[PDB]
Amino acid sequence: SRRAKSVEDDAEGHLIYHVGDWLQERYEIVSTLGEGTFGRVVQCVDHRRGGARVALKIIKNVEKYKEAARLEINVLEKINEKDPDNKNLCVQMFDWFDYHGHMCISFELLGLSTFDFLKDNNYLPYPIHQVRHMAFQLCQAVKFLHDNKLTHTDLKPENILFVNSDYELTYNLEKKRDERSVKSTAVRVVDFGSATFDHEHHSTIVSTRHYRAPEVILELGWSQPCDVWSIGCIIFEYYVGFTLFQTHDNREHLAMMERILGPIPSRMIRKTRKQKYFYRGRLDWDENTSAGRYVRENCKPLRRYLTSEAEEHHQLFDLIESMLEYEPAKRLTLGEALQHPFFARLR
Ligand SMILES: CNc1nc(NCc2ncccn2)c2c(-c3ccc4ncccc4c3)c[nH]c2n1
Numbered sequence: 001s002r003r004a005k006s007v008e009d010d011a012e013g014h015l016i017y018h019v020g021d022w023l024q025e026r027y028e029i030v031s032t033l034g035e036g037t038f039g040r041v042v043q044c045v046d047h048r049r050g051g052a053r054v055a056l057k058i059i060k061n062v063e064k065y066k067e068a069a070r071l072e073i074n075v076l077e078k079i080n081e082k083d084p085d086n087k088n089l090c091v092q093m094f095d096w097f098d099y100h101g102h103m104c105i106s107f108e109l110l111g112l113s114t115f116d117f118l119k120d121n122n123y124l125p126y127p128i129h130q131v132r133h134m135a136f137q138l139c140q141a142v143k144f145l146h147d148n149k150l151t152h153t154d155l156k157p158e159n160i161l162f163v164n165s166d167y168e169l170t171y172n173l174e175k176k177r178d179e180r181s182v183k184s185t186a187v188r189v190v191d192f193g194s195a196t197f198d199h200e201h202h203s204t205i206v207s208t209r210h211y212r213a214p215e216v217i218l219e220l221g222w223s224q225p226c227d228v229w230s231i232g233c234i235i236f237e238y239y240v241g242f243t244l245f246q247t248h249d250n251r252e253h254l255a256m257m258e259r260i261l262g263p264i265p266s267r268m269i270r271k272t273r274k275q276k277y278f279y280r281g282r283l284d285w286d287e288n289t290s291a292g293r294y295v296r297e298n299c300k301p302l303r304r305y306l307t308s309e310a311e312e313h314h315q316l317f318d319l320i321e322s323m324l325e326y327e328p329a330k331r332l333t334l335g336e337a338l339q340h341p342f343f344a345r346l347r
Contacts, residue, residue, distance in 0.1 A: 001032060013060035015102045023099050027056060038065045038193065043109065054094065055110065059103040068193040069103050075192040082148055089141035091190045110188055111165030115157035118241060121180045125241035128312060133185040135235045136346050141189040142231065143334040146224045153206045154194040155230040157237060160187050198223065210243045214257060215328050217250050218272040225328035232323030239316065240305055251277055255285045255295045260302050265326055315342035
């Protein structure tokens with residue numbers, strides 16, 4: 001899979017390595033599990049612990065991503081300190097080191113992302129019982145971070161991995177097709193390179209677009225509650241199998257929000273420094289442009305996404321709504337979220 005795509009695709013910063021290579025006379029590379037902006041994640045055998053398998057994030061040699069990693073490490077240090085028993089539901093770091101100039105970090109081996117599984121299943125949504133379990137663990141995992149003055153900032157299905165993504169095959173007679181279904185819905189949360197402590201500096205722009213919260217877009221300053229926005233977007237995505245906010249433009253994104261959730265409140269509209277997006281207390285957006293038609297055509301009021309009318313489904317959307325409250329101050333906290341009716345069945 002490590003084919004050069006272009007003349008611009010030199011091994012720029014990329015570590016030169018081949019399967020079989022040994023790192024620090026300990027870690028033998030077996031496969032490449034993924035790629036990213038930061039570099040690569042490979043599967044390794046830990047020969048110093050009886051051949052257990054691990055995942056090894058290997059960072060490019062570029063100063064931008066080196067610093068991100070430094071921050072990722074020290075967060076994970078802080079995390080293993082506050083919970084040496086590793087029941088938190090965030091991923092577990094084991095080790096970290098330099099090799100040939102590139103930083104490496106050693107995590108427990110997990111399965112595919114909730115995204116990947118979903119994509120590999122033709123976006124066939126998760127059944128509600130699994131949505132509940134995944135949502136629960138997601139909220140637990142992040143509550144933990146919030147309790148310790150942390151915000152993740154970049155939650156999304158790519159950063160929520162299954163412990164074990166082994167799956168049962170069930171053909172559908174009722175609808176004619178193949179349909180997977182994961183055995184164990186246990187998950188863990190990964191990627192702490194962007195995660196931020198309350199006292200540290202806050203980057204102006206923070207989540208992955210589709211999961212980004214209005215306070216961020218409007219540059220009103222953010223903190224713990226923007227994680228919750230993202231979580232709501234994720235939980236929605238799990239229920240219907242596609243992204244709530246499929247756009248790449250702030251104005252359009254704000255439009256979609258309005259269409260889906262109702263109008264943006266005025267406090268936010270006066271108090272933002274991004275006044276280009278508004279006019280006389282409303283979003284400066286024409287619904288009859290082709291953009292305007294696209295928005296109205298391809299998304300709709302939140303509750304029109306409900307399939308069944310069973311009580312448990314209504315509890316889900318109660319939860320989602322509360323999580324997608326426009327004002328961070330009023331938006332549901334994860335404490336409050338874990339107590340919600342929807343989750344009563346667990347605890
Ligand atoms: C399939 N087994 C597995 N895979 C993993 N990574 C899959 C992957 N990562 C990045 C890009 C593409 N694919 C991991 C990680 C880990 C650590 C850091 C991360 N940082 C940002 C994004 C994801 C990350 C995943 C921990 N345990 C794992 N087990």
